Amino acid sequence: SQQVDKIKASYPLFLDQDYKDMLAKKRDGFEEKYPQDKIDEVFQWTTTKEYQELNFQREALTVNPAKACQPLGAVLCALGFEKTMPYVHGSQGCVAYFRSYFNRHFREPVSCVSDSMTEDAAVFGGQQNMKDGLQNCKATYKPDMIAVSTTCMAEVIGDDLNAFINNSKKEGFIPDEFPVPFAHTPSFVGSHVTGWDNMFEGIARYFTLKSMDDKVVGSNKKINIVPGFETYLGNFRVIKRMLSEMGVGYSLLSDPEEVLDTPADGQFRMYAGGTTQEEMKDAPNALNTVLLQPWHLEKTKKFVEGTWKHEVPKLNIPMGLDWTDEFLMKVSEISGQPIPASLTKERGRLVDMMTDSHTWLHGKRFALWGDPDFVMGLVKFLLELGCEPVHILCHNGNKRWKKAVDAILAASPYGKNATVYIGKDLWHLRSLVFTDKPDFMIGNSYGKFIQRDTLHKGKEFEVPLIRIGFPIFDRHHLHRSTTLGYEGAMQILTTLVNSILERLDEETRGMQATDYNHDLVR
Amino acid sequence: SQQVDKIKASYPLFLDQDYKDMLAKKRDGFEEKYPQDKIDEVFQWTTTKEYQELNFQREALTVNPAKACQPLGAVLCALGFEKTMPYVHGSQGCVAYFRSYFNRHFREPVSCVSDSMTEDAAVFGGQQNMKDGLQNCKATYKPDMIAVSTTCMAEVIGDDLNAFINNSKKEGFIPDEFPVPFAHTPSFVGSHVTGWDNMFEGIARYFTLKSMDDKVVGSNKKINIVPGFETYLGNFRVIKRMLSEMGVGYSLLSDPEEVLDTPADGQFRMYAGGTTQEEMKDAPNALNTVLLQPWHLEKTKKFVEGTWKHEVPKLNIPMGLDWTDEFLMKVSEISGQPIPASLTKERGRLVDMMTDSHTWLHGKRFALWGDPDFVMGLVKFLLELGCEPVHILCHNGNKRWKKAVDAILAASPYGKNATVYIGKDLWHLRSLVFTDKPDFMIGNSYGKFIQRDTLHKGKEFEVPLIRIGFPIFDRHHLHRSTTLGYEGAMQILTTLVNSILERLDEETRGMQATDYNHDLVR
Amino acid sequence: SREEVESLIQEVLEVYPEKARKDRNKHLAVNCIISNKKSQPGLMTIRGCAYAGSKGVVWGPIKDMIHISHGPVGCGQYSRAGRRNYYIGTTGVNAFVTMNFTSDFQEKDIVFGGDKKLAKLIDEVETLFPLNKGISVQSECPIGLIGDDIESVSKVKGAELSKTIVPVRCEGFRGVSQSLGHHIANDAVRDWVLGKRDEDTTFASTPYDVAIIGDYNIGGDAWSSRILLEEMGLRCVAQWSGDGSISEIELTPKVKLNLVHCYRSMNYISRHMEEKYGIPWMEYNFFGPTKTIESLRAIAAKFDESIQKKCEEVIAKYKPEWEAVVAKYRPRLEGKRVMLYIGGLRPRHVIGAYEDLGMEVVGTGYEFAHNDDYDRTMKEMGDSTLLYDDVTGYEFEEFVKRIKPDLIGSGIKEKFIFQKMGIPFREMHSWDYSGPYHGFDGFAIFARDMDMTLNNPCWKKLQAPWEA
Amino acid sequence: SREEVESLIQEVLEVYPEKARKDRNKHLAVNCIISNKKSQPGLMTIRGCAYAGSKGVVWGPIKDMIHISHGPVGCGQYSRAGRRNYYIGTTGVNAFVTMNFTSDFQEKDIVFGGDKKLAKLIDEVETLFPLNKGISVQSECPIGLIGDDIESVSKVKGAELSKTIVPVRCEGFRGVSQSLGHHIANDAVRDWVLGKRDEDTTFASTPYDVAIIGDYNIGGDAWSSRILLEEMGLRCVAQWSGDGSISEIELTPKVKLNLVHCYRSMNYISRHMEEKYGIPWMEYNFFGPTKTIESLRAIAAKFDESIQKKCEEVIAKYKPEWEAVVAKYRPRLEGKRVMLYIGGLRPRHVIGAYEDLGMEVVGTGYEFAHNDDYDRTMKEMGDSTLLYDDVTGYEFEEFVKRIKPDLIGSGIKEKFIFQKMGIPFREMHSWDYSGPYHGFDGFAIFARDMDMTLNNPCWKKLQAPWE
Ligand code: CFM
Ligand code: CFM
Ligand code: CLF
Ligand code: CLF
Ligand SMILES: [Ca+2]
Ligand SMILES: [Ca+2]
């Protein structure tokens, strides 16, 4: 039943007695459900260290991964170029999924096409799909560039992207000079960050490999910036911002911040901003290239150094105090621009926030996850804040990255009780926050299910999620945030101290029970 | 007892059994405490409509005000000028409090002196205190200007500030040309905002009144901006930022954003930035003067219109979509600068956020409070979001203001269930959130005690607080936020939709009970 | 006007190369159309794949089984908790719907094959999730391409562990859309689950046993349907897939009538239960009061006078409630025009609910329908309205520019496009995180939602005041 | 030391106009100083007023009474829940500490007077807060100047309603600091509350009844003290003001000994109970293990062999705990130097706890102390350390620049200045929203708090790597 002046949606409608009764009856008559006492017994068993040892013994089963597949990455790389259509050669289901995944995180249109390879194409290859696909995309959507990646169907059957694009050009489906960069992106190798790297290096090769003869390193007097797979608009925004404050000539190569934030003004813009083809062609002429997220830009580093001859600075992701300082100082060294008064003040203001908020942050324990570069930057900033990064999980990390983070941890008293996990997933993490309970989790929205499980054991065992990462689907507009630079460090500091203080307020809100410590001033 | 490896602060130490027993014995042996059953009985009576009727009949007693007194505002106005010392002529306990009140909100140094009028000055006046006061402050803290206001002691004994400053100069205690603007700021008339106005109008008269024949309105081609009592650094910053994007010459008169955010870099800066004396003397030459918070800048409007002859535009506080548009369009008109493509984009990005977040905001009911101008801006933006501002309270509001907001409410279907309360306080609002329970409160930190009371009736009756206003003392760094312009509108919308979604997740976190609605994607 | 829509269609098609142009002309019609064909390459289809159809929609919802996305990490991760197929359970211990179980294929599995890995992870599922009541393995693209034999792993491990392990070959290259995945999934239910209790005579049947076939309980949709059927005196023995358990599936052989809501996804297994168990099935529609009333009386007519009396009692009970909803919301939406685009049922099935609020569906279409769905649509749509099968992004944007609808209802990949163009948009797959929309309690929410969005204050603010 | 410090003092004073210079000179000494004089105008004293001393610190904590800040809105608003005097209660129903009851003076009340307004709000308090057990009216500056007589209103309405209504003349212009407000507040308890049960003999006393006098339970400080005295077999009949009730205070005439923690605020009423009721009083110190032990043994010596034996049992129980605290934190704080500036007790009283962690207090001072407080300080401080009474903001910054302490412990108006200068700062009034710091359980929190701040990583990062 509904009362017309207060319509109830699914919650709380199904708590109404007649529905509760109807669901109790469904269960009892037909579901043959395990008795609740057994369900509770098994729940308690899944929280124990005994369960944890068997969980960590898994080698074949993955449960709740904290990574996605290669072509996802390639599409986001491609969207950063001016009037470019991401095109994934393979089967169409994949594209519908990549588009929905990003639609949900950015709450924006995400334009990408497929060339719809079906069963018959497995037996005969996808050449005709490439030929008509490219032709149809060019005429219908009017891209200035089509950037091609692949699905695992196309990867397993071994389609030669190069030959297929070259044959499309030879047979006149697309004009000979129309830009069609490609990258093979097998989903069974690495993860989404590997697909971004592969696509970027493929686009870089396309515009510069055969033109190197006339390029002099330093002649355009700019520094190239390669962002990596980045899903916060504030991160693209802040890098550009600080370099402009310093008067540093730069070229951001792959810039999606305009296509992922168009105005709702009465018309849909399929394409907006982005790195131009002219900037990619002129990129060898830069003084040097800085990789903002180096641990998933390995292929790119080898091409920038080997073909463009830039000596790519050994810089960590510009996250936290020390690594933003290093970033700005290296940019100053390369461009010969002084770090301006504005940035020195912004730095001092972050340090001032750390002195104000240090007593509440000191010794707070965190479990966290995400991509390699984001995670190490978060660990670094947490150590600078005097926090303990007790469980560091990176599903798509590798052995050398783990060696780097363990070195970072070894360098701080606050890294002493921390362990880095690579290859582990969120069901592995669930056990760790039960057996060695942290104070908070810093992660993406899949973390909500771990908070739900810890609350079921009891409120004193609940570990709150602090949403920083990708994907964040259950909150609106956090993709506009910043995690890089002093700006991003300021935002993270504020979110951490305030998450701690909201949890303290909740714990001290009980009248005559715990509210003696419900302070007006903290 | 304490475990040295896990030291417990008051929460949770006093929940230990031996402490619990000790407190129970204290109570029972010596407190003559009312029986718990009677306490519950009176608590439930204070949640009812009967209690509310009695509460609204209060004529003499105020309980939990939502305003402070005049010289607090005067001190904030004074802090906005270059190298000036706020000086409150009267008794010292006042200054200790003003300083602490702002130290707690900005987590920054707040410099301000008193001239310590004691007991005997009540009989003989505070003249000697002004003479030595001014002289000592001048030599010890070396300001370029001292801005004088008054405590209620000095008001009730009728000290003539003007004669006293003139006689300090006459006797040689301070140089004759040393800037000493003053304002009588009675703590028994109006509130903190009236003090801001009185101080500003006093500083404006001081640099301008007796110099007017030299001025031509329009000759410096600038627009003067008077901020009003403002406690978000982001509000000062966004006004200057948008005016610079427009290429508009301006003068923000009273600008404290530098002194309230100095870098922690090894040295304390007593003064930083602020409006110069030169900007104040040149302010008659501006094209016009815009008052960002007009409902508490009445005396200032009368002075800039009467003496400077500026035709102050009838503009509301630049909060929400319409009033930021009207502000920008008026600034364009006055200065002949076109509104740039950046601000047109930014506007559309706000409209885009409103379209993505409208299904969660629609019909959400709020109780809210704050200063007159802030409250009406928030009411306006709430109506623009399709939310219902059900209880609008402004303790320091006046009759005419109430009329304006009631008319704003009448021009919207979302204002149908809303009432504006002036002269009413947080104990009055406590009743309203019980008898006509909203979904959230938007207010300052005193509102945490109303949330505590609603949870005690039951979790179903808890009204969560969203902290927007002054003072916010129990969260860190929220004073760096913005509530003005498209920027501030974007921050308010994000905080509102996410507060709703965090409460929905809290309500649907119950395993096998409410978590059927615990959606990953919202 | 017929001619106007027809010239709109030729106009839009001018952009295509001839191959594309001639094929798409066959898929756009004024009501005469073809459906269920290959998507044209590079034209930005809204369609998904056969795995989305099988794992994402038929199997995923079954709450007490564990469903393995077998193949690389993408597919399971992108489909993890995307669809709101609601259920009551303790997730991670006896219920598993919002979790992602995957074999995360690396290169060694592509080269050597993933069958030993499947076997080892069925063992791991059994140690770490002891209360699961069956396992399905949803094949992703590479499983078929590399020649693995998931049937042998399922039969051998199934027999070894005395547990239902269902191999599903719903590799996304199969078919042309999510549709063939429904069929593959219906046949895997038929072959590995449905017949388990054929020799079991202990279920006590009653003359009123029924099963809801093809309701995935989006936002609680099936719960808001079930309550009405049981108030009408029927016993719902099973709910196929939404909040569905494996024993309810196995008990569906004992019902007297199958009630089909989603024909496209479940007509296959319905035909099978009729041919093998003699169980009749009928199509119904619980969207809006007119169709729910029509349906309740049709279902009741297949039984006896007591159930028909109870039907009229249920209809009289809810009559003040839905009448209150139209009294409030129909004046607010009267004469507004809607353009829809959804999968394989809701394009025609929600039209009556829009008409109960006095709205007009001027355009509709399906991602993966077949011509029998279109035959059914003919009857529900008006004269001269626009029909589009497998519409390209380009065509849909172009149709909206000219038709200028007041509201568009479609999926998440379409939502933000039309909102920027200033048209009110409601997600008609996930109900924009609202719902239920089925039954009489669902109509109240549906009505409130169309209103809050079509008449929302933000739509009047798209043009900057200085831009005119 | 010595010579350098006197050089520092005269150098800093050279900025003052001579009247200021000659006065301030008398208030800065090397361990000789005068105190409790008026503040020199315009020099940014850290002092508060007599209302802060009465409403903010003595009366405000009494949990089951309502305290009216009578006068304009400022004072009651700035003092609302600013001090963490903890209590157990249901606020707004039977307890009222964190609320702000005010008469919010508008101009008609300055002109006509606020006495009829006070009478009508006392009735409003009674209808709306029935469970209150007494009312006090704390006068803000205007009340005396204006000629109101809150005494008449209190007697008349008190009588009419059979309620204790205490008039408190703590107008901020009286005295020179928070100090006279303590005195006014003690005399208001004496004249209007303390004698109510004098002819009442039903309270069954025992030989071990005690009352904690002058502990306002900041962060639970009195609770961490009470547990130790009662583990030692004593019965604490009252807690004066922190978590205090009115009946506890009315019951205090019946105790055997008054245990004074804050001498400055409560010595007046202690002197009175010794004269009128013959109850003896003794000062003690529960900051850090050394002082708590010294104090538990001195209090126990006032009773008999059983309390003295239980005293040694208590010391023995807590011994492993405080030894683990010093073993963990003393190696981390050994040899660090602290400069303090607080109100009227803690400047001398926390020094023993700092020394227990191996730290040295190189400078201390009080806002409103009197000469008997400085006599007591003399002993606790080492030779050649800096003393300052009513220090100005300028002097405190200059003394810090020259001395360069490793930690400064003072109040909120001082905090952010010194943190920007790179000195670790701990709030020694509010305990920086941490605590308790009294007793053995508080020592554990004190120790980790000094450590977390003095050794925090943020202090190493104040200069940019380019400057
Ligand atoms: S797009 Fe239903 S045939 Fe299938 S997920 Fe939606 S219009 Fe599907 S009604 Fe259903 S629950 Fe659906 S909404 Fe048949 S199940 S493959 Mo996307
Ligand atoms: S400044 Fe205590 S004489 Fe009084 S508020 Fe702090 S050093 Fe007071 S110990 Fe106490 S609880 Fe205090 S810390 Fe005497 S009560 S007027 Mo500010
Ligand atoms: S059409 Fe469909 S969704 Fe596509 S793959 Fe095929 S069954 Fe799956 Fe999963 S991992 Fe990624 S998204 Fe593909 S490329 Fe390899
Ligand atoms: S010294 Fe002390 S705090 Fe000052 S007034 Fe006097 S008792 Fe009070 Fe309250 S309202 Fe404001 S702050 Fe004053 S000026 Fe009138
Ligand atoms: Ca958007
Ligand atoms: Ca600060």
Q: In chain B, what are the domain boundaries?
A: 69-214, 215-319, 320-363+484-522, 364-469
Q: How far apart are CA A381 and CA A387, in angstroms?
A: 9
If you compute the radius of gyration of chain A from its CA atoms, what whole number of angstroms results? 25
Residue A264 with chain B: CB contacts under 8 Å: 348, 351-352, 355
* D344 CB within 6 A, ligand 2: yes
**Could you say which of D136, D161, D192 is where a domain stops?**
D192
- List the beta bridge partners of residue A86: A147
Which residue of chain D has the CA closest to B32?
A: D247
Q: Which of A152, A193, A198 to mutate to test the pocket of ligand 3 (most atoms within 8 A of CB)?
A: A152
Q: How far apart are CA A228 and CA A210, in angstroms?
A: 24
Residue C327 placed within a domain: no
Same domain, C293 and C399: no
Token representation of residue B521:
């994607």
A258 min Cα distance to partner chain C (Å):
14
Plot region of C43 (φ>0 → left; ψ -120 to 50 → alpha; else → beta): alpha
* B387 annotated to bind ligand: no
Q: Which of D283, D346, D376 to mutate to test the pocket of ligand 2 (most atoms within 8 A of CB)?
A: D346
A198 min Cα distance to partner chain C (Å):
17
User: D306, C204, C435: which is closest to A8 by C-alpha?
Assistant: C435
* A189 CB within 6 A, ligand 3: no
- Check B110, B112, B152, B387 and give the catalytic one: B152
* A481 annotated to bind ligand: no
Q: Which helix (H) or strand (E) segment is B464 a member of?
A: none
CA distances from D154 to B446, D55, D123 (A): 30, 17, 12
**Could you say which of D151, D172, D192 is where a domain stops?**
D192
With beta carbons less than 8 A apart as the criterion, state whether C88 and C111 touch.
Answer: no
Same domain, D55 and D188: yes
- The secondary structure of residue A371, as a DSSP letter, is -
The three-state secondary structure class of C102 is strand
Same domain, D43 and D140: no
**Residue B404, C-beta contacts closer than 8 angstroms, at least 6 positions apart:** B376
Q: What is the CATH number of the domain that holds D373?
A: 3.40.50.1980
The torsion defined by the Cα of A206, A207, A212 and A213, in degrees rounded to 10, comes to 110
Ligand 2 centroid vs B15 CA: distance in angstroms? 26
Same domain, C204 and C183: no
- List the beta bridge partners of residue D218: D85
Cis, bond preceding A284 (omega within 30 deg of 0) = no
- Do the Cβ atoms of A386 and D88 come within 8 Å? no
Q: How far apart are CA A208 and CA A310, in angstroms?
A: 13
- The total of structural domains in chain D comes to 3
Which CATH class name applies to B69-214?
A: alpha beta
Identify the burial level of D337 via C-beta atoms within 10 angstroms of its C-beta, where 0-12 means exposed, 13-18 middle and 19 or more buried. middle
* C218 CB within 6 A, ligand 1: yes
Q: How many CB atoms lie within 10 A of CB A17?
A: 7
Residue B347 with chain C: CB contacts under 8 Å: 464
Same domain, C416 and C351: yes
- Do the Cβ atoms of B474 and A501 come within 8 Å? yes
- The secondary structure of residue A400, as a DSSP letter, is H
**Domain A215-319 grouped into CATH 3.40.50.1980:** yes
Q: How far apart are CA C434 and CA C446, in angstroms?
A: 8
Q: How far apart are CA A137 and CA A88, in angstroms?
A: 12
Q: How far apart are CA C24 and CA C11, in angstroms?
A: 12
CA distances from C179 to B343, B420, C46, C68, C260 (A): 47, 57, 13, 20, 17
User: B429, B446, B427: which is closest to B438 by C-alpha?
Assistant: B429
Q: How far apart are CA B412 and CA B423, in angstroms?
A: 25
Range of the domain at C128: 50-192
Chain C adjacent subunits, 3+ CB pairs under 8 A: A, B
Length of chain D: 467
Same domain, D219 and D188: no
* D349 annotated to bind ligand: no
CB nearest B362 (choices: C419, C456, C465): C456
Same domain, C455 and C391: yes
The three-state secondary structure class of C27 is coil
Same domain, D65 and D119: yes
The reply to whether domains A69-214 and A215-319 share a CATH topology is yes
Q: How far apart are CA D193 and CA D134, in angstroms?
A: 10
With beta carbons less than 8 A apart as the criterion, state whether B264 and D462 touch.
Answer: yes
The three-state secondary structure class of C223 is helix
**Residue B373, C-beta contacts closer than 8 angstroms, at least 6 positions apart:** B228, B292, B293, B294, B295, B296, B316, B317
Identify the burial level of B493 via C-beta atoms within 10 angstroms of its C-beta, where 0-12 means exposed, 13-18 middle and 19 or more buried. buried
Same domain, C136 and C152: yes
Q: Which helix (H) or strand (E) segment is A414 a member of?
A: none
Same domain, C263 and C377: no
Residue D316 placed within a domain: no
Three-class secondary structure assignment of chain D: CCHHHHHHHHHHHCCCCHHHHHHHHCCEEECCCCCCCCCCCCCCECCCCHHHHHHHHHHCCCCCCEEEEECCHHHHHHCCCCCCECCCCCECCCECCCCCEECCCCHHHHHHCCHHHHHHHHHHHHHHCCCCCCEEEEECCHHHHCCCCHHHHHHHHHHHHCCCEEEECCCCCCCCCHHHHHHHHHHHHHHHCCCCCCCCCCCCCCCCEEEEEEECCECCCCHHHHHHHHHCCCEEEEEEECCCCHHHHHHHHHCCEEEECCHHHHHHHHHHHHHHHCCCEEECCCEHHHHHHHHHHHHHCCCCHHHHHHHHHHHHHHHHHHHHHHHHHHHHHCCCEEEECECCCHHHHCHHHHHHCCCEEEEEEECCCCHHHHHHHHHHCCCCCEEEECCEHHHHHHHHHHHCCCEEEECHHHHHHHHHCCCCEEECCCHHHCCCCCHHHHHHHHHHHHHHHHCCHHHHHCCCCCC
Same domain, D350 and D424: yes
CA distances from B417 to B49, B406, B409, B410, C415 (A): 17, 11, 9, 10, 32
* D262 annotated to bind ligand: yes
Ligand 6 centroid vs B77 CA: distance in angstroms? 19
With DSSP H G I counted as helix, E B as strand and the rest as coil, what are the percentages for chain A, rounded to 5? 50, 10, 35
B507 min Cα distance to partner chain D (Å):
26
With beta carbons less than 8 A apart as the criterion, state whether A142 and A113 touch.
Answer: no
With beta carbons less than 8 A apart as the criterion, state whether C172 and C51 touch.
Answer: yes
Residue A438's identity, in one-letter code, is P
Residue A101 with chain C: CB contacts under 8 Å: 78
- Do the Cβ atoms of B475 and A511 come within 8 Å? no
- List the beta bridge partners of residue C66: C135
Residue C317 placed within a domain: no
**Could you say which of D163, D192, D221 is where a domain stops?**
D192
To the query of whether residue A112 is one of the catalytic residues in this protein, the response is no
- Do the Cβ atoms of A520 and B14 come within 8 Å? no
Q: How far apart are CA A319 and CA A342, in angstroms?
A: 18
- The secondary structure of residue A275, as a DSSP letter, is B
Residue D312 placed within a domain: no
Q: How far apart are CA B195 and CA B184, in angstroms?
A: 8
- Apex B305 CA angle, B303 and B307, nearest 5: 60
Residue A67 with chain C: CB contacts under 8 Å: 73, 77
Ligand 2 centroid vs D416 CA: distance in angstroms? 20
Identify the burial level of B25 via C-beta atoms within 10 angstroms of its C-beta, where 0-12 means exposed, 13-18 middle and 19 or more buried. middle
Residue D322 placed within a domain: no
Identify the burial level of A131 via C-beta atoms within 10 angstroms of its C-beta, where 0-12 means exposed, 13-18 middle and 19 or more buried. buried
Handedness of CA A133, A137, A140, A144 (dihedral sign): negative
Residue B429's identity, in one-letter code, is L
Q: How far apart are CA A504 and CA D453, in angstroms?
A: 20
* C429 annotated to bind ligand: yes
- Topology (CATH level 3) of domain A320-363+484-522: Nitrogenase Molybdenum-iron Protein, subunit B; domain 4 (1.20.89)
* D261 CB within 6 A, ligand 2: no
With beta carbons less than 8 A apart as the criterion, state whether B113 and B90 touch.
Answer: no
Tokens 């019951």 correspond to D251
Q: How many CB atoms lie within 10 A of CB B522?
A: 21
Same domain, D364 and D457: yes
Residue C287 placed within a domain: yes
Query: What atom in ligand 1 is closest to the CA of residue C263?
Result: 14
Which CATH class name applies to B364-469?
A: alpha beta
The torsion defined by the Cα of D275, D279, D282 and D284, in degrees rounded to 10, comes to -130
